Amino acid sequence: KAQITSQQLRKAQLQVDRFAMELEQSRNLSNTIVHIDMDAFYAAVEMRDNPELKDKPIAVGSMSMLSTSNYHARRFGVRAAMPGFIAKRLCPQLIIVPPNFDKYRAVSKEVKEILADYDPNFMAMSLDEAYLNITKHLEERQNWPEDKRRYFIKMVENDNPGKEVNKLSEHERSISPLLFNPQILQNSVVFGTSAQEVVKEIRFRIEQKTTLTASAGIAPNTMLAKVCSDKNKPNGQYQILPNRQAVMDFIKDLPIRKVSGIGKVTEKMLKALGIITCTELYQQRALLSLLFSETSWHYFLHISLGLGSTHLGKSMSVERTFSEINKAEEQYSLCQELCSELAQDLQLKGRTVTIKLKNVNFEVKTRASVSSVVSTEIFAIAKELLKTEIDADFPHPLRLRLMGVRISS
């Protein structure tokens, strides 16, 4: 049999190491990519709508093929893309529930609405996973006050102290015993400015809206991020910091089987060459450029160098946070000096004027108007979207802490 010459293998090394150097010199660590993964999405959804499944092994699909296994079922080894009879052998009591994608699509949309807030250009890979580049969000959140990172936590008849606390003030204290709107708020929680905090805010909002949990990964790039979210799986999140050492430390011996991107077949061929960890993937880079497709070893090299996409261009918006405002007059003129704050012309003006509000308990509510169309303003649409809000629980006034306007078509 012929062999690769301990010479020609050398030429390769030079060519590979020339490409490796050109890659090392250009690695960006300045971006923060997030990968979101809804925990056993389809199944968790069914579990939600039918509480009878909450404490059991279930999977979405049919006997011919499973699609999504809840974590109870996964402990038995039940996996998606696994034939039903094999799952039933592993787990006899498994309850296989038929898919219903319309209910999955809807919940997913809800999730997407939340992911858009942090990156309007996020990439939705499927109904249960997405990539976000929060780089820009972070640069801004940096200067945000507590009230712009405060959300209504779900715990309405709660004993929370109101304005009667005024008796403890210096001027009412001693007098109370001498005598002859309660302003009661509902709980809300705050998240910090760091990347980990931002992702916790996201997961929190999702669980509060959907009842479902999600895992996530934070890293300098798309590839690392994907692997990351998988680490503290059910409802956990892990991050790799923007330093090469942390990147290479994570990549050290990382089993190839944990690197989504390398196909099952390619993994099989790699095993035959005795290659498992990403380190070995780097060690045998010369032999790999000679044996695998150009597309495959290029990928191999990037993986072994902990490199991936650092990027994945709808809105023009304003938004003010303030102390409680509940008088309509105040709410409108603010909407006017806000629609006017949209002087940011550069191309008063065009299509979908979405409104954003946050009440006194930090409950979020967004409402827009797919559309209006041209002829010979911002406000005129904001007024209406705002008016129908003052008229909602119409007898009770709208108690605000936040107001924002955003153009989008």
User: Strands across the sheet with 353-359, in order?
Assistant: 316-325, 400-407, 353-359, 364-367
**What are the extents of the domains in the chain?**
1-31+244-311, 32-39+99-154+188-243, 40-98, 314-409
Greatest Cα pair distance in the chain: 109
Residue 58 and residue 94 in contact, taking contact as beta carbons nearer than 8 Å:
yes
Secondary structure element (H or E) that encloses residue 109, with its range: helix 101-118
Q: Give me 366's structure tokens.
A: 């967004």
CATH architecture, domain 40-98: 3-Layer(aba) Sandwich (3.40)
E runs forming strands in 79-184: 95-97, 123-124, 129-133, 150-152
Give the CATH fold of the 1-31+244-311 domain: DNA polymerase; domain 1 (1.10.150)
φ/ψ (deg, to 5) at 158: -120, 125
**Pairing relation of β-strands 237-239 and 214-219?**
parallel
Which residues fall in the annotated binding site for Mg(2+)? 37, 128-129
Which residues in the chain are immediately followed by a break of C to N over 2.5 Å? 155, 180, 312, 313, 347, 369, 376
Q: Estimate the crossing angle of helix 328-339 against helix 378-390, to 10 degrees.
A: 160
Residue 137 is which amino acid?
Answer: H
Residue 235 and residue 57 in contact, taking contact as beta carbons nearer than 8 Å:
no
DSSP string, 312-372: ----EEEEEEEEEE--HHHHHHHHHHHHSSTT-------S-EEEEEEETT--EEEE-----
Residue 361 is which amino acid?
Answer: N
The set of catalytic residues is 129
Report the alpha-carbon distance of residue 126 to residue 121 in Å, rounded. 15
Q: Which of the listed CATH numbers 3.40.50.300, 3.30.365.10, 3.30.1280.10, 3.30.70.270 matches domain 32-39+99-154+188-243?
A: 3.30.70.270
- Give the Cβ contact number of residue 60 at 10 Å: 26
Report the alpha-carbon distance of residue 363 to residue 373 in Å, rounded. 31
Report the alpha-carbon distance of residue 88 to residue 55 in Å, rounded. 17
- Rounded-to-10 torsion of CA 69, 71, 74, 79: 30
Q: Which of the listed CATH numbers 3.30.1490.100, 3.40.800.20, 3.40.50.620, 3.40.50.720 matches domain 314-409?
A: 3.30.1490.100
Burial 246-283 (b: 16+ CB within 10 A, else e): bbeebbeebebeebeebeeebeeebeeeebbbbbbbbe
Report the alpha-carbon distance of residue 337 to residue 355 in Å, rounded. 14
Alpha-carbon distances of 355 from 118, 164, 382, rounded to whole Å: 17, 34, 7
Residue 409 is which amino acid?
Answer: S
Classify residue 25 by its DSSP letter.
T
Report the alpha-carbon distance of residue 195 to residue 34 in Å, rounded. 9
Report the alpha-carbon distance of residue 408 to residue 402 in Å, rounded. 20
Residue 115 and residue 130 in contact, taking contact as beta carbons nearer than 8 Å:
yes
Report the alpha-carbon distance of residue 288 to residue 281 in Å, rounded. 8
Report the alpha-carbon distance of residue 63 to residue 284 in Å, rounded. 42
- Say whether 32-39+99-154+188-243 and 1-31+244-311 share the same fold: no
Quoted resolution (Å): 2.4
Q: Which residues pair with 69 in a beta bridge?
A: 59
Report the alpha-carbon distance of residue 219 to residue 141 in Å, rounded. 18
Residue 183 and residue 204 in contact, taking contact as beta carbons nearer than 8 Å:
no
Which residues fall in the annotated binding site? 37, 128-129
Residue 82 and residue 107 in contact, taking contact as beta carbons nearer than 8 Å:
no
Q: Count how many Cα atoms sit within 13 Å of the Cα of residue 138 in the half-sphere of its side chain.
A: 16
